[PDB]
């Protein structure tokens, strides 16, 4: 049960859940390379989400909805995390490290680039830890769709569960900071600082979607995710 | 310097800073037919903007920033601030958005403007969420000031720039402390305090989202040569 895990068991489950770092397939279509990278990461994000404690307790519908809302925020927070020790650069993959003026190739990409670097600098200033990072990523998964669901009794029960798991991750975040020797005030301050960054990740994702949907296939992402989440039980 | 206020002094100063509740400019003898909602909401929003500027200048730490940084923070945050206000004053009216005391709308009347009902539904749910959390006015004013200080903080490398960011974050830390204090006085346990802080701050990300979609919806309508930065500066000259 996801709600009976301790803070240490929670951190431990999220670390264990971490997806692998994938590699990119001169400047070809840089958008080609990045889209191919994202598509391959999506698969591993599905496996990952299924290991976030609480997630597989939800309906298939709500699982898809959550990933459809959060997929870019999740990709972005991973990017920001990887790029943390590389100032002025975004490590999309170990073999695809781009700087600002490489961004000025796709129109509109520069604005998003600058925002991503700034978040990465912020994580670096705060010395964000891996254990904290995985907590934030899981919050993104669980939080980003919750407000834009139906309100059936089933749907109400689903929303209550999500808020219990989010409360457990908060618990876990606080436990980490205490385990790291911060004061209670410092803990509350750091918790606030990190959750406010989630607002900026949401903002970037929204601008990202605008940018991506400005470039005009017959395979909608919803359908894509459903197909991937809706696994059979034949391969035991 | 704002860094030396207590929680109650911070709480009290924000309460003191609260803007008034404006009304919709209404010919109430006139039919509702010959009256576009968007016009009413635009005129309401413009008049609120003036008061928002007055409020912002009384948020502790705000006037310590440069004029350039004050304008930028308001530039990024103004619609979120309008939204959180609408959500707060809509709490006691389930399924309805109190834009002004003489302008209460439901989802149906939202449907009259093309891409509006998406945003109404989102705003309604935010209002429902605040109602189920029993959000206090003391907490509300803290959240509203966090939006002001946080929303443009990443979109500003001069020595002054770093110092300015640094200052904004010290004040945010101060308002965080104030929120925890208020939850302590309400009788919440330490666990319950940090959970509630989290829950409240996670709602800020949904308010940002709604703000982003509101902006898409507004620019799908009107296409300003005069940038918003210039207008926010000019307003400070027009009415101050
Ligand atoms: C911001 C961002 C982060 C990414 C992180 C990844 O781990 C992988 C790809 C990323 C990525 O490119 C994508 C390209 C196509 C697509 O369907 C999904 C992502 C972007 C990105 C790049 C340029 C423009 C844009 O709006 C968004
Ligand atoms: C969401 C919202 C909240 C408002 C809160 C207020 O206190 C006053 C007006 C509001 C308001 O209408 C506006 C109209 C013009 C404009 O320049 C700013 C706001 C909206 C709103 C409504 C429908 C579409 C949209 O994009 C935005």
Beta carbons within 10 angstroms of residue A158's beta carbon: 21
β-bridge mates for residue B103, sequence order? B100
- Six-digit token string for B126: 């935010």
Burial label for B36, CB within 10 Å (0-12, 13-18, 19+), is: exposed
Q: How far is CA B173 from the centre of its chain?
A: 19
- Six-digit token string for B222: 């009107």
> Which atom of ligand 2 lies nearest, measured to the CA of B119?
1
Residues 6+ apart with CB under 8 A from A120: A80, A81, A83, A84, A86, A87, A90
- Is B144 at the interface with chain A, CB within 8 A? no
Q: Cα-flanking dihedrals φ and ψ of residue A209, to 5°?
A: -60, -45
Resolution in A: 2.4
Residues 6+ apart with CB under 8 A from B152: B72, B73, B75, B76, B77
Strands of chain B, DSSP E:
96-100, 103-106
Range of the domain at B11: 1-240
Residues at the binding site of B for 17beta-estradiol are: 48, 89, 217
Residue B103 in 3-state DSSP?
Answer: strand
> Which atom of ligand 1 lies nearest, measured to the CA of A109?
24
Method: X-ray
- Quick check: A143 and B121 in contact, CB under 8 A? no
Write down how long chain B is: 240
Give me the CATH number covering residue B221. 1.10.565.10
Residue nearest atom 8 of ligand 1, based on CA coordinates: A38
- Is A164 at the interface with chain B, CB within 8 A? no
Residues 6+ apart with CB under 8 A from A24: A33, A34, A36, A37, A92, A93, A95, A96
Helix, strand counts (H, E) of chain B: 9, 2
| C-alpha to C-alpha distance for A176 and B134, rounded to whole angstroms | 29
Q: Which of A212, A214, A216, A221 for mutating ligand 1's site (highest number of atoms within 8 Å of CB)?
A: A212
Residue A98 in 3-state DSSP?
Answer: strand
| C-alpha to C-alpha distance for A184 and B142, rounded to whole angstroms | 20
- Our answer on whether the CB atom of A122 is closer than 6 Å to any ligand 1 atom is no
Tally the C-alpha atoms within 13 A of residue B235's C-alpha that lie toward its C-beta. Answer: 21
- Six-digit token string for A222: 């919803």
Residues at the binding site of A for 17beta-estradiol are: 41, 82, 211
β-bridge mates for residue A89, sequence order? A99
- Quick check: B44 and B100 in contact, CB under 8 A? yes
Instruction: Give how many domains chain B has, as a whole number.
Output: 1
What stretch of H or E contains A62? Answer: helix A60-83
């Amino acid at each position: 049960l996801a709600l009976s895990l301790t803070a240490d068991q929670m951190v431990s489950a999220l670390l264990d859940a971490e997806p692998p770092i994938l590699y990119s397939e001169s400047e070809a279509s840089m958008m080609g390379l990045l889209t191919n990278l994202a598509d391959r990461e999506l698969v591993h994000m599905i496996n990952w989400a299924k290991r976030v404690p609480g997630f597989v307790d939800l309906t298939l519908h709500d699982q898809v909805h959550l990933l459809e809302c959060a997929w870019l925020e999740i990709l972005m927070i991973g990017l920001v995390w990887r790029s943390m020790e590389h100032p002025g650069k975004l490590l999309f993959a170990p073999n695809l490290l781009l700087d600002r003026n490489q961004g000025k190739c796709v129109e509109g990409m520069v604005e998003i680039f600058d925002m991503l670097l700034a978040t990465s600098s912020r994580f670096r200033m705060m010395n964000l830890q891996g254990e904290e990072f995985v907590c934030l990523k899981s919050i993104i998964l669980l939080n980003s769709g919750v407000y834009t669901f139906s309100s059936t009794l089933k749907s109400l029960e689903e929303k209550d569960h999500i808020h219990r798991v989010l409360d457990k991750i908060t618990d876990t975040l606080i436990h980490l900071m205490a385990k790291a020797g911060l004061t209670l005030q410092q803990q509350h301050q750091r918790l606030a600082q990190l959750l406010l960054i989630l607002s900026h990740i949401r903002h970037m994702s929204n601008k990202g979607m605008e940018h991506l949907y400005s470039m005009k296939n017959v395979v909608p992402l919803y359908d894509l995710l459903l197909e991937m989440l809706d696994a059979h039980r034949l391969h035991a």
